[PDB]
Each structure stands twice: as C-alpha cells, then as structure tokens.
C-alpha cells in the first residue's frame, strides 16, 4: 500500500475513512474557543492521573508562531505531526514574505494539508480537528475551525471534541460581542464545564493577545464561584 | 471472480475488463463515416441532455487532412485527441511532410494496448473513427483491445444497427457517387440510425479539401434535400 487508495467513495457517495476520522475526533477531548474585540480565549479539557502523571507534559493548547495558537481534538500523535508541519509552514511564510503568517492563511494551509492527506495514495486521513486562533494582516483577530474533511470555517465561538453539540448550544445561548477578559474567561469556563466535571484540574485555559499567549494560573482558575 | 482485475484471463480465455471497456462504446451516440475514391464524409449525432444545454461536440480536427469521431467516455477521447494532435504536429515540426495515417493509427493502437497490461491502469473506454486523406481517402476504426481495422464504410454507437444495415444495402453506390450524393447518403444513414441544424455534426475531407465542418446554411439545404 505504498501508493494505494485508502480513501474511496462508498456506494452512497461518502468517503468512509473521513467519517472514521470524524469518529476519532469525537473520541477526542473537548476544546472551546471564544473571540473578543482584540483577544481570544482557548480552553481545553485535561485528563491526568493524580500523583503519577506529569501535569505539564500534556499540552493541547500550542503556540504556532508569534501570533497564532492551536487547540486540537482527536489523535495526539497526528496532532503533534500536523502542528510541527504548521510551525514549519509559518516560518517558511515568514521567510518567503518577511511578514508573520496571518491566521487565515495558515488555517487554509492546514485545511489543504488535511485534504491532501484524504486524497493522495498510500496515506491515512488525519484523525484530528483543530481550532486555530490568531490575527490577520489588518490586525483583526479571528478563530478558524478545521475538520478532518479539509473544510475550514471562521467562527465567533466554537467547540470541538466529545459532546461538542452541547457546548456549541451553550455558546450559542450565552455569547455576546466585545466582552471583557474576565467575562470571556468565565464564559469559556462555564461553557466547557457543561460536559466535563466541575473541578479546577480538568481544564487548561489560555488568553491570546497581540503580545503573547498567556496561560491562566491554576489559582486564578480556582475560585470560579 | 474472473472480472475483478484486468490481467486475469477467464477460463474461456477472455479479458472481462477489456470487454466491459468495449461495452462502454455502445452507450455513445451514433456516428457514421463513408467514402468514395476521392472524398470522406463523417456524420454524427450531437448529444443534448436538455433544451437549455448546448449540443455536445462530436467531431474534432487532428490535422489539415485528418479528423476524428469518438464514442464512449469523453475524457478518454480528449486524451487520445490531444495525443494524436501532438503526434501530428511533432511530425510536422521534426519533418517537413505529413505523418502517415498508418503509423499514427499504429501509434494510437499501441497507446491503447499499453494500458491493458499493467494492473494499475485500465483499458481505454472509447472507440475511435479516424477519417483522413493522406493521398487517397481512408477510414480507420480503433477499439479498446489494441486492435484497429480499415473500413470502406463504418458506423457505431447507440442504435447503430439500422445505419449499419443501410450501409450494407448501399455500400456499392458510394464509390462512384458524387460528393453531394455521398453527403446525402451519409445523412440518410444517420437518419436511419434514429435531424436539425444543431443536433447533427458533419465534416468532409478529400483531395484538395482540408478538414471542414459544413456550415449551418449548407447543412440546412442538405437536410432539406435529405427529406
């Protein structure tokens, strides 16, 4: 199977392997992205065995370049290799144009790479869905969600992973435009906590600004009323 | 079990995939081609799926004195058409003379054959009708299984049996008849296959006559004379 078609059309018209990659995404952990005026908030579930597993080693929120960040859901090794490819292309664009890569360009590149992997021979589809967040050429911030199918789309707020529909509904019935940083962080917390149990250790949340992607300390996450 | 792949011979000794590729020609529209000592005329039925759709092109030029008709999968026809056109122009660039139709048809048949051996590739699902005047008029048939044949008259496609019977009836007239009579004979054969100013494609080639699609008006009075 060096050059063979793993992804092919079914009798109905679907690509079965893309659907199976979507199932693999559905097994993955829950991640949430919310936008604001000039900053974003990404919050992702954590699952660590107490007292034995290193909390810091698992890292689902990743910095891609100066001004882009990623939060995936699905297979972890697939996510690591895709993130390394994305970082390589970010630096390649910044070498080939002498500007940082905007969020829309790199989201399109990740979607194109996933489409290529669903279409070339002797290659398996990526079993991961991503929520990239970043800034545009005109300094405007936005969030792009990308499926295993290679289709991308921009969102004001979005959720991926296990029980994504419930969090999407909660974000729909609670999102407002241009909310403060504390309000955005609290909304992200109470949205992602609708499916994962109420505890401080089962989540890691970060805030993306033009300067850097800061991580919220566990003390600040605690005392959420 | 014996038709899962193209390299397996049946117990009878048959290639089922190549025969399915041969079956693919019968779905195409009818085309006819006849000749005299001087001229060759090719007729075809353009496909019109709906009244808002324009008719589909059925006849293509290859050279100043070579043209074609196709029946089968259109992408395969486009591939073979581009191959023939590049071959003719490459011969005209390398050499200052026209390519032999015999060599060109042999090359096209070899290209057909080369896909039916390796398991990765599939046989061409299209049959070709090559009309030309190299120094005398000539018609050639090319099939999926790498074979080709000369023809005094030829027809194939959907419901081509009636036009074939008309050709069997009127073959002995085509040699001595005039170009007008030959055009009417070909149009009557295509009529027997089942004609307006849009759904019928027509082309002529012969002595001191390059490839030329007949105009709309000329086709109109030719169809009137056919009635």
């Amino acid at each position: 199977s060096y050059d063979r078609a793993i992804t092919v059309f079914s009798p109905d018209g679907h690509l079965l392997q893309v659907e199976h990659a979507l199932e693999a995404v559905k097994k993955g952990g829950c991640a949430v992205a919310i936008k604001s005026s000039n900053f974003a908030v990404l919050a992702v579930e954590k699952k660590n065995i107490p007292k034995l597993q290193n909390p810091k080693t698992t890292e689902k929120l990743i910095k891609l370049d100066e001004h882009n960040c990623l939060a995936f859901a699905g297979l972890n090794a697939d996510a690591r290799v895709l993130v390394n490819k994305t970082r390589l292309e970010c630096q390649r664009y910044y070498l080939n144009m002498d500007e940082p890569a905007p969020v829309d360009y790199i989201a399109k590149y990740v979607a194109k790479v996933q489409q290529k992997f669903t279409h070339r021979g002797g290659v398996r589809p990526f079993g991961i869905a991503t929520l990239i967040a970043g800034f545009k050429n005109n300094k405007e911030i936005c969030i792009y969600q990308t499926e295993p199918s290679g289709i991308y789309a921009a969102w004001k707020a979005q959720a991926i992973g296990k029980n994504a529909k419930i969090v999407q509904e909660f974000l729909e019935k609670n999102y407002q435009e241009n909310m403060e940083q504390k309000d955005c962080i609290f909304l992200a917390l109470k949205a992602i906590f609708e499916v994962v149990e109420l505890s401080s250790k089962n989540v890691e949340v970060a805030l993306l600004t033009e300067k850097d992607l800061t991580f919220i300390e566990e003390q600040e996450i605690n005392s959420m009323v | 079990l014996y038709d899962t792949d193209n390299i397996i011979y049946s117990p009878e000794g048959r290639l089922y995939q190549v025969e399915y590729a041969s079956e693919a020609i019968k779905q195409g529209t009818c085309a006819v081609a006849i000749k005299s000592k001087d001229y060759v005329v090719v007729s075809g039925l353009k496909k019109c799926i709906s009244k808002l759709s324009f008719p589909q092109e059925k006849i293509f030029k290859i050279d100043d004195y070579i043209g074609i008709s196709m029946s089968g999968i259109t992408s395969d026809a486009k591939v073979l058409t581009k191959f023939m056109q590049n071959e003719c122009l490459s011969h005209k660039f390398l050499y200052n003379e026209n390519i032999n139709i015999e060599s060109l048809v042999r090359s096209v048949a070899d290209k057909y054959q080369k896909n039916t051996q390796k398991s990765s590739k599939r046989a061409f699902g299209v049959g070709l009708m090559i009309a030309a005047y190299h120094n005398e008029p000539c018609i050639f048939e090319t099939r999926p299984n790498g074979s080709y044949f000369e023809y005094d008259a030829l027809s194939f496609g959907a419901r081509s049996h009636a036009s074939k019977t008309y050709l069997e009836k009127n073959l002995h007239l085509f040699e001595e008849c005039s170009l007008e009579e030959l055009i009417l004979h070909c149009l009557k054969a295509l009529k027997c296959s089942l004609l307006t100013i849009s759904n019928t494609a027509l082309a002529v080639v012969g002595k001191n006559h390059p490839w030329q699609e007949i105009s709309s008006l000329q086709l109109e009075e030719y169809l009137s004379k056919v009635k």
Binding site: S1, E23, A24, K26, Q53, N76, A77, V81, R124 | -
Partner: protein
C-alpha cells in the same frame, strides 16, 4: 487481495493494528520506572528461558542510549532494538548539530514521530514496543517518559508497563512520594516488582535494575540486588 490494509481506520475510528500491538505489549514482561530526589530508577522482569543462559552480562530490558538518556523496554525485543539504535543515532545527530547534549523530550518526540509515521504512511505494520525513557537535562531536570505503538507519549513521575501493570501502578500510587532517596526508590522498585509477580520475596535471579544520577548510569550487578533484597 493479499494486502491486509494495516494503515486504515476502523468503523469506530480505530487502528486495529495499533490496539493489537498494545495488547501484545500487555503480554510482555513487566517494566517499572520512577523518579527520586537523586536519580531516575528503572527496573524489569526476565522471562526465564533456561539457566544455561549467560545472565552474567544480559540486560534484555534496559538499554543505554546516551550518557544522559536510557530506556526500559516492554514489547517485542527485535522491534525495540532497531528503535534503540535510531534513538542513539538521533542523540549523536543532535550533538553533532548543536554541540550540545539533547533534551530527553526531543528524543522522545522524534522516536514517537517515527512510530506515528509507521502508523500513517505506507503499508507496513507498526512497532509493537513501549519505552520508559529516563534521563537528565539541565533545561527540565530528571524526566521519565512513557511511549506507545501509536506514537502517543506522556511524562510521568512513576509508572509501569507490561503484564499486570495495574497492580504495579496501584502500588506506586500507594507508596510513591515526591521526596525519596535513592535507597528508598530502589526499595520501592523492588516492592513493586515483587507485588507484580505476586511474590513477597523477589527473586534476584530474574530482576534487572538500573538507574541514572547527575551524569552517570549504574547497572546493578546480579550480586548488588541481593543486598537490597535482604533490606
């Protein structure tokens, strides 16, 4: 029809070869790793083939990758040795590139990326081995990383792999502490290896034990475990 299609998803969004490799690793011999205040401890179990073996110099579980990184194996040995060779090649390649000893996490990432590449590209079976890679670096400190055939790894303070790893993990959860001496770490490793095999007195003839301390790697000779067994 001879292709088994190893590198394809299942209807449940699974790679069947990967799970077969994991439950093959579950049937392998037991391996244990933990971190103490002075050094990283690794230990293993030896599948008795015969007494006619040259056990004197036989470490079929723990291997050296570099003077700052070593690993403990659980799975198929022939599949583990080629990955150990690749790990050594990448360590010396990093030292050749940057004039500096590699961090442990980067090497873990590289080998797990090779595992992922085998689970995604081509038509080849995966590597059915799990590693507990211990090491020291100045950037982070003492590190222990567990890996899988899927190319998914995670950092640990103390963990186990192989047969009956649930019992070993339970003993580690019960007994392990953040501040532990080297002797305490060795005694806990002996206790976990004993409880894994349902024996109170461990057999020194079938225990491999080694550690790394800030860098120097000690592979305990077959006599050295006997002092720890009595204590």
């Amino acid at each position: 029809r001879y292709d088994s299609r190893t590198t394809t998803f299942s209807p449940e969004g699974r790679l069947y070869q990967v799970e077969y490799a994991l439950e093959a690793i579950n049937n392998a011999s037991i391996t244990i790793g933990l971190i103490t205040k002075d050094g990283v401890i690794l230990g293993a179990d030896k599948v008795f083939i015969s007494k006619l073996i040259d056990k004197a110099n036989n470490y079929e579980k723990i291997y050296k990758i570099d003077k700052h990184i070593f690993c403990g194996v659980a799975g198929l040995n022939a599949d583990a040795n080629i990955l150990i060779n690749q790990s050594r090649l990448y360590a010396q390649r990093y030292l050749y590139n940057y004039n500096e000893v590699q961090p442990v996490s980067q090497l873990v990432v590289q080998i797990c990326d090779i595992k992922q590449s085998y689970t995604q590209y081509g038509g080849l079976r995966p590597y059915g081995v799990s590693f507990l890679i211990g090491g020291y670096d100045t950037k982070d400190g003492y590190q222990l990383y567990h890996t899988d055939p899927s190319g998914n790894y995670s950092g640990w303070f103390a963990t186990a792999i192989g047969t009956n790893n649930l019992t070993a993990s339970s003993v580690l959860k019960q007994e392990w502490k953040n501040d532990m001496t080297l002797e305490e770490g060795l005694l806990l490793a002996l206790k976990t290896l004993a409880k894994s095999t349902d024996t109170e007195i461990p057999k020194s003839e079938k225990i491999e034990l080694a550690y790394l301390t800030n860098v120097y790697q000690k592979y305990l000779t077959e006599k050295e475990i006997e002092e720890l067994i009595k204590l």
